Design a protein around this ligand. Structure first.
Ligand SMILES: OC[C@H]1O[C@@H](O[C@H]2[C@H](O)[C@@H](O)[C@H](O)O[C@@H]2CO)[C@H](O)[C@@H](O)[C@H]1O
Length: 140
């Protein structure tokens, strides 16, 4: 089946216990830009609040933040970058009471404490030059 077209947008409803699962492959083909970006918006509009932002800079860092009232807030940086140019990845973002649990390829890498209640998220966008296999939201 074909890769999803990027930028890829998905309307969503998140609650405690929801799990966002993103599968794809990153390419080392950008210059001064991340190779993957994930944004959780509070409206189906790119000017709305970003409750959760993640971007991947291969070989350098994974960056997480929020954009509240138009402003990028406290940046949280990881120098553990479990993504590899040309290799497939499994990115899982699990909504807990107090944080998102960020998981890559079966490794628990970061807990991002909620700044906006995740019940306010309405749209996920996945973009940059990722070859995107699937994006889904599950719960039980
Ligand atoms: O905080 C996420 C936010 O970062 C912006 O870029 C930052 C960059 O991460 C930092 O290393 C640099 O020192 O400052 C920049 C602020 O302009 C991105 O532009 C933005 O899209 C988010 O990714």
């Amino acid at each position: 089946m074909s890769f999803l077209t990027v930028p890829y947008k998905l309307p969503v409803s998140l609650s405690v216990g929801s799990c966002v699962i993103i599968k794809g492959t990153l390419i080392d083909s950008s210059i001064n830009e991340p190779q993957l970006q994930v944004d959780f918006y509070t409206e189906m509009n790119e000017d709305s609040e970003i409750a959760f932002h993640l971007n991947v800079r291969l070989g350098r860092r994974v960056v997480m933040n929020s954009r509240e009232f138009g402003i990028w807030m406290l940046e949280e940086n990881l120098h553990y970058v479990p993504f590899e140019d040309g290799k497939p990845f499994d990115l899982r973002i699990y909504v807990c009471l107090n944080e998102y649990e960020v998981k890559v390829n079966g490794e628990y890498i970061y807990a991002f404490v909620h700044r906006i209640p995740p019940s306010y998220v309405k749209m996920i966008q996945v973009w940059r030059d990722v070859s995107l296999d699937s994006v889904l939201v599950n719960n039980g």
